[PDB]
């Protein structure tokens, strides 16, 4: 896993979370661009963000992306019950595959 | 899109499997074929990156020489939403191949967020 991210976020009810995603050089994120997904484990994932920052089709604007020269972060609020998934940043060129990073799980402290 | 997939295969180890998925309710061509494993010991890898319109494929370093993929041509249900399929052939399986494998539509037709995948099936489960 070479786009490393933190694996340990949590966030509570109608609070602001957020999540990093970094790496080396050679597999950065300034020269790259940078995507993001919501994957349940045993599911089929979910986009959220595809060129850096743009929001897919069917994604309440909650969220959002930013790009540093160094690391990618996702701002997401209104954290209800259903964000309790497992977000994993990719990293792509336009000629060429992505490149999945690890696996970071999120926690909705403060349910019920 | 409404992707399916072949299914579940149990299968002995040091052989070759051919999975397939059948797109239906979109055009074939437009959209590049994501394959992709996600083995629960080792998370997410990427497979490849088949186009169906033309010969252009693009594969993982670690994965050379050892899959390829190939498509079906289309049939029109209508215009502008067609039913096409794609398979992948994977030669010499081991334990380390064992979770699930989607297949998914690219995002869009152009621009530099191409080859990144949109729509997923269901999977199947290769327990090797
Ligand atoms: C019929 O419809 C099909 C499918 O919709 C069209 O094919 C698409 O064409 C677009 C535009 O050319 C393609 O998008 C481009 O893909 C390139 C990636 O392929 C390159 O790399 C592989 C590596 O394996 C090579 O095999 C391949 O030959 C290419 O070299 C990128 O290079 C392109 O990026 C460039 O343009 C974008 C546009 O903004 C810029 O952002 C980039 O910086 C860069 O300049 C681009 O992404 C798309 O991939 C094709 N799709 C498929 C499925 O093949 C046909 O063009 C269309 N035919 C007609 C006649 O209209």
């Known amino acids: 896993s070479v786009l490393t991210q933190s694996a340990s976020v949590s966030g509570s009810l109608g609070q602001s979370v957020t999540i990093s995603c970094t790496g080396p050089n050679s597999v950065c994120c300034s020269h790259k661009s940078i995507s993001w997904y919501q994957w349940p484990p045993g599911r089929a994932p979910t986009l959220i963000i595809y060129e850096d920052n743009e929001r897919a089709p069917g994604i309440s604007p909650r969220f959002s992306g930013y790009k540093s020269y160094w690391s990618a972060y996702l701002t997401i609020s209104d954290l209800r019950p259903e964000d309790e998934t497992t977000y994993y940043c990719c990293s792509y060129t336009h000629n060429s595959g992505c490149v999945f990073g690890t696996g970071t799980k999120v926690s909705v402290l403060g349910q019920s | 899109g409404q992707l399916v997939q072949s299914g579940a295969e149990l299968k002995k180890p040091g052989a070759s499997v051919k999975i397939s998925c059948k797109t239906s309710?979109?055009?074939?061509?437009?959209?590049?074929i994501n394959w992709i494993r996600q083995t629960a010991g080792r998370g997410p890898e990427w497979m490849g990156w088949?186009?169906?319109?033309?010969?252009?494929?693009?594969?993982?370093?670690?994965?050379?020489?050892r899959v390829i993929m190939t498509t079906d041509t289309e049939v029109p249900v209508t215009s502008f939403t067609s039913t096409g399929a794609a398979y992948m052939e994977i030669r010499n399986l081991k334990f380390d191949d064992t979770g699930t494998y989607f297949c998914?539509?690219?995002?869009?037709?152009?621009?530099?967020?191409?080859?990144?995948?949109?729509?997923w099936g269901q999977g199947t489960l290769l327990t090797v």
């Open positions: 998914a539509k690219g995002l869009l037709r152009d621009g530099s967020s191409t080859w990144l995948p949109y729509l």
């Open positions: 309710g979109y055009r074939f061509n437009f959209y590049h």
């Open positions: 088949i186009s169906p319109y033309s010969g252009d494929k693009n594969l993982a370093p670690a994965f050379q020489d």
